[PDB]
Enzyme design. Structure first.
Site, short mmCIF file in Angstrom:
data_model
loop_
_atom_site.label_atom_id
_atom_site.label_comp_id
_atom_site.label_asym_id
_atom_site.label_seq_id
_atom_site.Cartn_x
_atom_site.Cartn_y
_atom_site.Cartn_z
N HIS A 142 0.83 -1.19 0.00
CA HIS A 142 0.00 0.00 0.00
C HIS A 142 0.87 1.25 0.00
O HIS A 142 2.08 1.21 0.22
CB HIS A 142 -1.01 -0.01 1.18
CG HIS A 142 -0.46 0.48 2.48
ND1 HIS A 142 -1.22 1.18 3.39
CD2 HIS A 142 0.78 0.37 3.03
CE1 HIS A 142 -0.48 1.48 4.44
NE2 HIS A 142 0.74 1.00 4.25
N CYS A 191 3.68 5.55 5.54
CA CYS A 191 3.85 4.34 6.33
C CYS A 191 5.31 3.95 6.28
O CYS A 191 5.97 4.14 5.25
CB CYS A 191 2.96 3.23 5.78
SG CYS A 191 2.99 1.68 6.62
N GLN A 228 -7.37 -2.54 9.81
CA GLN A 228 -8.55 -1.70 9.91
C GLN A 228 -9.54 -2.09 8.82
O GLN A 228 -9.17 -2.42 7.69
CB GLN A 228 -8.18 -0.23 9.80
CG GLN A 228 -7.13 0.17 10.79
CD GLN A 228 -6.43 1.45 10.41
OE1 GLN A 228 -6.82 2.53 10.86
NE2 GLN A 228 -5.38 1.35 9.59
N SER A 283 -5.87 5.99 9.66
CA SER A 283 -4.50 6.40 9.37
C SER A 283 -4.46 7.45 8.27
O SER A 283 -3.56 8.29 8.27
CB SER A 283 -3.64 5.19 9.01
OG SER A 283 -3.83 4.11 9.92
N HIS A 307 -5.34 5.49 1.48
CA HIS A 307 -4.53 4.38 1.01
C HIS A 307 -4.73 4.14 -0.49
O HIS A 307 -5.83 4.30 -1.02
CB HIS A 307 -4.89 3.09 1.75
CG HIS A 307 -4.83 3.18 3.24
ND1 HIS A 307 -3.77 2.68 3.96
CD2 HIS A 307 -5.69 3.70 4.14
CE1 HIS A 307 -3.99 2.88 5.25
NE2 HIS A 307 -5.14 3.51 5.39
O1 LIG Z 1 4.16 -0.16 9.72
C1 LIG Z 1 3.89 -1.53 9.52
C2 LIG Z 1 4.95 -2.16 8.64
C3 LIG Z 1 4.71 -3.38 8.02
C4 LIG Z 1 5.65 -3.99 7.20
C5 LIG Z 1 6.89 -3.35 7.01
N1 LIG Z 1 7.92 -3.79 6.27
S1 LIG Z 1 9.09 -2.69 6.44
N2 LIG Z 1 8.38 -1.60 7.39
C6 LIG Z 1 7.15 -2.10 7.65
C7 LIG Z 1 6.17 -1.51 8.47
#
Ligand SMILES: OCc1ccc2nsnc2c1
Ligand SMILES: OCc1ccc2nsnc2c1
Length: 147
Positions: A43, A97, A115, A138, A141
């Site tokens: 995402h 993110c 969610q 959040s 997306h």
């Molecule tokens: O924030 C949640 C999340 C999930 C997977 C991920 N791979 S690398 N950084 C990450 C962060």
């Protein structure tokens, strides 16, 4: 008649019919093709000032409005659908993110861990399909189901 959550619609500028999915907010010209325990999605998140945490690795204090955030999402979707830019490239540069480091990938997951609007959209996407804007606490997306 049509797969889960699709409806017929008419383009306001063209007059030709198109298809829309109210679960994923996807839209296309083509009649959509044709549930598993787990799916795998990547995402791209654009946060805004009313995001549960208005901060990210890109901005200590995210100040954009939801409307500004939606405009950014729409832009990326255009570039992705036109092919000028890849989803992974845009996630990696612009997702709020931390999953931006991993080209947006989140891993696989079941129902009940994400969610709900994110989960509904993720599970309503077919493999390889992209969502329209999806709204959560959040932010906004773009979701790509990869498995
Ligand atoms: O924030 C949640 C999340 C999930 C997977 C991920 N791979 S690398 N950084 C990450 C962060
Ligand atoms: O859901 C939080 C989360 C999940 C998977 C991850 N891989 S690396 N960083 C991560 C963070």
């Amino acid at each position: 008649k049509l797969p889960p959550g699709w409806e017929k619609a008419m383009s306001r500028s063209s007059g030709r019919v198109y298809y829309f999915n109210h679960i994923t907010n996807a839209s296309q010209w083509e009649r959509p093709s044709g549930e598993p325990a787990r799916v795998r999605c990547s995402h791209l998140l654009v946060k805004h000032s009313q995001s549960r945490r208005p901060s990210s690795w890109r901005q200590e204090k995210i100040t954009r409005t939801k409307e500004e955030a939606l405009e950014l999402i729409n832009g990326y979707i255009q570039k992705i659908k036109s092919g000028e830019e890849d989803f992974e490239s845009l996630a990696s540069q612009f997702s709020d993110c931390s999953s931006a480091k991993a080209r947006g990938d989140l891993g696989a997951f079941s129902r009940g861990q994400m969610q709900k609007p994110f989960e509904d959209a993720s599970f309503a996407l077919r493999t390889g399909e992209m969502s329209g804007p999806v709204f959560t606490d959040s932010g906004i997306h773009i979701i790509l189901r990869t498995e």
